[PDB]
Design a protein around this ligand. Structure first.
Ligand SMILES: *[C@@H]1O[C@H](CO)[C@@H](O[C@@H]2O[C@H](CO)[C@@H](O[C@@H]3O[C@H](CO)[C@@H](O)[C@H](O)[C@@H]3O)[C@H](O)[C@H]2NC(C)=O)[C@H](O)[C@H]1NC(C)=O
Ligand SMILES: *[C@@H]1O[C@H](CO)[C@@H](O[C@@H]2O[C@H](CO)[C@@H](O)[C@H](O)[C@H]2NC(C)=O)[C@H](O)[C@H]1NC(C)=O
Lengths: 196, 138, 195
């Protein structure tokens, strides 16, 4: 049986992960099934993870998952000799526990205007939610980070380009998810680039 | 004077209202778990959506009315508190949706109550957002 | 015999509800006030035996109308209820949005910050509350007072071709196109363009 079955969320996605116990052979596969908080009797089995040696299986896009309601997952170790009993996981509510990720900043520059439009890779089918992003802009040696006011997804953060020498300006963004409580993400890797 | 359609501000609900709805659903779940499982099935079955605007407004109005009735009846018995904000927002949304609609032109009750309580979050966040994007009937 | 309160109003800016009233012409002694709000067909005493002539009602939900009702009391004796109705989503007013103006050469860059609701987080502003939201701007050369109106589609606006060494004063406000309800013109900020 997998010892640590844990259902967590990373980058707008829901992952069920587990590590197994010692003594099992090296030919064990894994069967995974998910259960919603309502109608707990149902134990729908995840096909993409069915009989997969992978120790991680995505949960965001399944046969029928109501991200609004809570859901949990169970895993089992399947071997030709025998199958271990299922090991369940603690409940997870998506819209109240989804972990956001920083966006990709598409940098478009004008003669005096710089745009930091944020692009996100959201799961194909997820509930729409606030995706305001904070943009941090600085110089290669300044250290102090200029934080711009949050802007909604689909709105480029606009930075005035004061004329100066060509310097290596760096940029980053952070996702703020405020469905019911603001959930801030982490600042992305700086996109350091020369500016004339 | 007839009331204008002001559905545009329901696209993003107040965070505290959604937190209250979450707490209410958690309390209902705790009540269901404490007394044991219910024989009647209360699966939050998917509701088939349609691209029609006025039909969508009518359906969200029906959902608002049913949820308001169930939650108000439950609150009368004081089984679970904290339904105040939810009830007043349900009344306001139903009033606005009905105003827009008019201006433009043997299952046990327990499983029904469970179903509407579970689908309250989806109705507040998904169906209401689509209704707000829809506006008045074309 | 106790005179009722006069000139009761509900001042609500950015959903900051404060019910105010004018104290009456009581002969002498102390005249306290008691204010309640209707909820579930029974009035709940928001303020009891308060010396102040106003009380805040921001605790009440921004959704749905309310009935406010305040009287004056003289020790055991009492006065008649003075009552108003208040719809926060419609009777509130939008405060002046914050302005970030930077002038370079003959170009003035404008960044608008939505007014914030005191009971919510900094992320949920009045712009989130009124989703169908727009920013209006009026600018004029100092003294000329010819209101030129520009309505940016986003929170940024770039005015161009400004005659050098002449100050331009600008103001911003929050407009709601669907209902045709303007907010409050922000403080008129005057910028002198660089030579
Ligand atoms: C900045 O990045 C945002 C990223 O969202 C861009 O907004 C996106 O623009 C595309 C069009 O280029 C939109 O796609 C369209 O979506 C509609 C459904 O709403 C669909 O029917 C169309 O066929 C098309 O696929 C997309 O929805 C839109 N997303 C958002 C969140 O607004 C934006 O264009 C970029 N540039 C600027 C200047 O903002
Ligand atoms: C995975 O599960 C095992 C077993 O439940 C955990 O092992 C325990 O870890 C705690 C950490 O403080 C120790 O105090 C216990 O002595 C460990 N053994 C038991 C039997 O509880 C382990 O922490 C879990 N996580 C990981 C990453 O291995």
């Amino acid at each position: 049986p997998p010892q640590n079955v844990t259902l967590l969320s990373q980058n707008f996605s829901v992952y069920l992960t587990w590590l197994p116990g010692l003594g099992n052979p090296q030919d064990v596969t894994y069967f995974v099934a998910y259960q919603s908080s309502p109608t707990r009797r149902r134990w729908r089995e995840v096909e993409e993870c069915a009989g997969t040696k992978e120790l991680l299986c995505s949960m965001m896009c399944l046969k029928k998952q109501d991200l609004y309601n809570k859901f949990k997952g169970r895993v089992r170790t399947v071997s030709p000799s025998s199958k271990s009993p299922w090991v369940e996981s603690e409940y997870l509510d998506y819209l109240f526990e989804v972990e956001p990720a920083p966006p990709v900043l598409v940098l478009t520059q004008t003669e005096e205007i710089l745009s930091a439009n944020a692009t996100y890779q959201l799961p194909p089918c997820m509930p729409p939610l606030d995706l305001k992003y904070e943009v941090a802009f600085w110089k290669e040696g300044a250290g102090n980070k200029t934080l711009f006011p949050v802007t909604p997804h689909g709105q480029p953060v606009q930075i005035t380009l004061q004329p100066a020498a060509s310097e290596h300006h760096c940029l980053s963004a952070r996702t703020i998810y405020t469905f019911s409580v603001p959930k801030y993400s982490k600042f992305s890797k700086p996109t350091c680039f020369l500016l004339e | 004077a007839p009331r204008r359609c002001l559905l545009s501000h329901y696209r993003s609900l107040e965070p505290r209202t959604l937190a209250a709805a979450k707490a209410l659903r958690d309390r209902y779940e705790e009540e269901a778990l404490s007394w044991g499982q219910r024989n009647c099935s209360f699966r939050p079955r998917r509701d088939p959506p349609r691209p029609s605007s006025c039909a969508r407004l009518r359906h969200v109005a029906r959902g608002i009315a049913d949820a308001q009735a169930v939650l108000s009846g439950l609150h009368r018995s004081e089984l679970l508190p904290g339904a105040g904000p939810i009830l007043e927002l349900l009344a306001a949304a139903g009033r606005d949706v009905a105003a827009c609609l008019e201006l433009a032109r043997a299952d046990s009750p327990r499983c029904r109550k469970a179903s509407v309580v579970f689908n309250l979050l989806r109705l507040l966040t998904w169906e209401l957002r689509l209704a707000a994007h829809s506006g008045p009937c074309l | 015999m106790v005179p009722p309160p006069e000139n009761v109003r509900m001042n609500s800016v950015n959903f900051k509800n404060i019910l105010q009233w004018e104290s009456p012409a009581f002969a002498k002694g102390q005249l306290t006030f008691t204010a309640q709000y209707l909820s579930y067909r029974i009035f709940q005493d928001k303020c009891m035996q308060t010396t102040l002539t106003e009380c805040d009602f921001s605790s009440l939900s921004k959704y749905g109308d309310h009935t406010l009702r305040v009287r004056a009391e003289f020790a055991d004796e009492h006065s008649d209820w003075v009552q108003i109705t208040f719809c926060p989503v419609d009777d509130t007013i939008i405060g002046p949005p914050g302005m970030q103006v930077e002038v370079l050469a003959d170009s003035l860059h404008m960044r608008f910050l939505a007014p914030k609701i005191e009971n919510e987080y900094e992320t949920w502003t009045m712009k989130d509350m009124y989703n169908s939201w727009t920013y209006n701007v009026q600018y004029w050369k100092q003294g000329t007072d010819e209101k030129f109106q520009i309505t940016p589609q986003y929170d940024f606006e770039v005015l161009r071709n400004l005659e050098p060494r002449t100050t331009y004063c600008v103001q911003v406000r929050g407009f709601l196109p669907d209902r045709n309800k303007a907010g409050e013109w922000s403080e008129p900020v005057c910028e002198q363009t660089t030579h």
